[PDB]
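Email to the structure team, subject: mammary gland protein 40 model.

Hi all, the expression group asked for a predicted structure before they design truncation constructs. Nothing fancy, just the tokens so they can compare against earlier work. One-line instruction: predict mammary gland protein 40, return tokens.
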Amino acid sequence: YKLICYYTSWSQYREGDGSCFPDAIDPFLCTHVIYSFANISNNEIDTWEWNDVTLYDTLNTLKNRNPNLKTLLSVGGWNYGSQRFSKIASKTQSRRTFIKSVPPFLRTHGFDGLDLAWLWPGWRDKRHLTTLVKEMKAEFVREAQAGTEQLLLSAAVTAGKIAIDRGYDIAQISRHLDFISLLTYDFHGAWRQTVGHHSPLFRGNEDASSRFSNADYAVSYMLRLGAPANKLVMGIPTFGRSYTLASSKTDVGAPISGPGIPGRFTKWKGILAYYEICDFLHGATTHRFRDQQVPYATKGNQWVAYDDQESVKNKARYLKNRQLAGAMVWALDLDDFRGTFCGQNLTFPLTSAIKDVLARV
Ligand SMILES: *[C@@H]1O[C@H](CO)[C@@H](O[C@@H]2O[C@H](CO)[C@@H](O)[C@H](O)[C@H]2NC(C)=O)[C@H](O)[C@H]1NC(C)=O
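Reply from the structure team: attached below.
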């Protein structure tokens, strides 16, 4: 099994226990840790926050404890516009400078591969990733003739029908990537005004349109597109999405006035870290959609759509049955990495649950 576990750079600024450095990360836990994004400046990869060079050394030493543990840097992200990305891989001047620019960098810092997080390319881009990604690997195969372990190249891909079709030539980009992470917690989110679960496993026999919106379809689709089994990694949320209810209506179908308040540690509108959610559950009403096989919680005006131990194992089982390459956990820093908020003295409750399913077979 492969268990790619992202780590986000900025989680360091969370106050108190919220704060998480390459420190709290178990070296034996996942197989691949990906430092969440980098930046680009003067068409040459570059760091993002100020002390990255150090965090790049905190994280990469975990490998001294687990010689098999592989690390990766991701380029792109939410806070990195498509425009800047789309402007780099169409002007072959800018594309080839950026390429040549990263093997050295990744080497210098001990990263074993690069992970492209071009957050959703447009229909005018499908042609451009294709060759950006393509020859990135021509470079990587070339650098490897220097007598060293070939750098790895992977991509984070959206999981929405429309989103995939629009800007991804999966069939061809699958034969140059080492693995693909399916953002399979990409289905409901923020707000055309109904309460919904962002990462459903199955359909929910209840509504018809938006079958497209679930992990099973996303997965069958990708395989049908031509993406090999042994190269698909199914994304699993370690966080939840919050919603301020607009009405005493709580069952799914209920109105939404807005985004959910922040957690005291996470401080984002509409997002909650699993550890924050564990405290939220105290005094709550827990629910679970039987077919999508995922839970949600409500307290006061707040409505939370999230994943707990079993919902995540269930996914883990699904992943194993179709014979995928492995699982992906969005943010190690959104799990209970301190393992002090969620009752059981277990640390990284969620990411372990997956591991367990992926391990006892
Ligand atoms: C990412 O790299 C860019 C490269 O210029 C850094 O620069 C800013 O972005 C605009 C767009 O070109 C520039 O015109 C401004 O001069 C810059 N603004 C700032 C805040 O200095 C950018 O800072 C890098 N990103 C991070 C956060 O690491």
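The first strand starts at residue 2 and ends at 8. Residues 1-238+307-361 form a domain with the TIM Barrel fold (CATH 3.20.20.80). Ping us if the truncation boundaries need rechecking.
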